[PDB]
Design a protein around this ligand. Sequence first.
Ligand code: OCA
Length: 182
Amino acid sequence: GMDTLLILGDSLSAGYRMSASAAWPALLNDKWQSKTSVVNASISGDTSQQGLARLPALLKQHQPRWVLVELGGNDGLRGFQPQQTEQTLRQILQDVKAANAEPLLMQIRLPANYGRRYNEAFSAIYPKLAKEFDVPLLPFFLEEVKKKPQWMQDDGIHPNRDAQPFIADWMAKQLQPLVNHD
Ligand SMILES: CCCCCCCC(=O)O
């Protein structure tokens, strides 16, 4: 069957200031041509808590086989306590599993110039949770994308539309073992 991958993300998945159809999850949906459906449920600026608030309706609506969780970066960019992000992501993971879906957790990191103890504590939550729940820990693309000015919006913060095909292709590779297409 044609399973659904739900993406529960922030602007890194929604695309910042662009059409939904331009963002990499839609490009991935197109690449997969109904082998698998990708539903992007991402909102620019969302904290982990905001994503968690949206999750139950999405699980009910979409009954996904997998949920790619790409959240917490906004919490970290706002300096909130890592344990709160960890606990929120924990609850998301619990809810995904309780809906008979498989979570996939994307590692998030802050940039190299961020406060370093804090950044390390923030980034550590992701491998910890992936081990705790025994779920896939997906790699994070942003630092590599930021190396390409031609893939970044003017702010130097958000990937642009030209980045999206590259991210889609890379994500397809990361997700290949999970969807197991013919
Ligand atoms: C560096 C951590 C990643 C942050 C991405 C979220 C930005 C936004 O959602 O507008």
